[PDB]
């Protein structure tokens, strides 16, 4: 479990989160929340550190993650932003949790801290 091998598995996890099979619930998370289109103008009063898969993929491609756990922190931040902002019963929370189930299932293969 070198850091290279771990970062390689994190790239595979991200590819899986962006894969076609999950599009039906992952699409709200591909790009920054479109606050202006949706009219969610209190979003930035609640969420001070936005994150989305496109941002994570740009960081991964730029070699910006030093280890698997910094990658995990950014992925989990994207999900926590959704859970912090949206009502727990909301449809986008259901979609977020489905995408998180994909992440957590695969991230379970990464050695602990
Ligand atoms: C404090 C507050 O007002 N909460 C709140 C929020 C909602 N939410 C929506 O109405 C909504 C509709 C379509 C939406 C979203 C949210 C999001 C979204 C937003 C943020 C994050 N982080 C991730 C995602 C995927 N994407 N799409 C396509 C409704 C009622 C309340 C009271």
Numbering used by the authors: 266 to 378
Relevant lines from the article:
BRDT is a tissue-restricted BET subfamily member expressed in pachytene spermatocytes, diplotene spermatocytes, and round spermatids. Based on proof-of-principle knockout and in vivo chemical biology studies, BRDT is a validated germ cell target for small-molecule contraceptives. Deletions of either BD1 or both BD1 and BD2 in the mouse BRDT gene result in male sterility, indicating that BRDT is a testis-specific target for male contraception. Our drug discovery campaign on BRDT, a validated spermatogenic-specific contraceptive target, yielded rapid discovery of potent and specific inhibitors of the second bromodomain of BRDT that have unique binding characteristics to BRDT-BD2 relative to BRDT-BD1.
Interestingly, truncation from CDD-1102 to compound 20 (herein called CDD-1302) showed no loss in activity despite the loss of >100 g/mol molecular weight. The BRDT-BD2/CDD-1102 crystal contained two molecules per asymmetric unit, whereas the BRDT-BD2/CDD-1302 crystal contained four. The overall structure of four molecules in the BRDT-BD2/CDD-1302 crystal was nearly identical except for a short segment of the ZA loop (residues 305 to 308). In two of the BRDT-BD2/CDD-1302 complexes in the crystal (molecules A and B), an arginine residue (R341) from the neighboring molecule in the crystal interacted with N307 and the bound CDD-1302 through hydrogen bonds. The additional CDD-1302 molecules bound at molecules C and D showed several contacts with other protein molecules in the asymmetric unit mediated through Jeffamine ED-2000 and ordered waters. These contacts suggested that the different ZA loop conformations and the second CDD-1302 binding were caused by crystal packing. The BRDT-BD2/CDD-1302 complex revealed that CDD-1302 binds similarly to CDD-1102 excluding the contacts with the missing methyl benzamide ring.
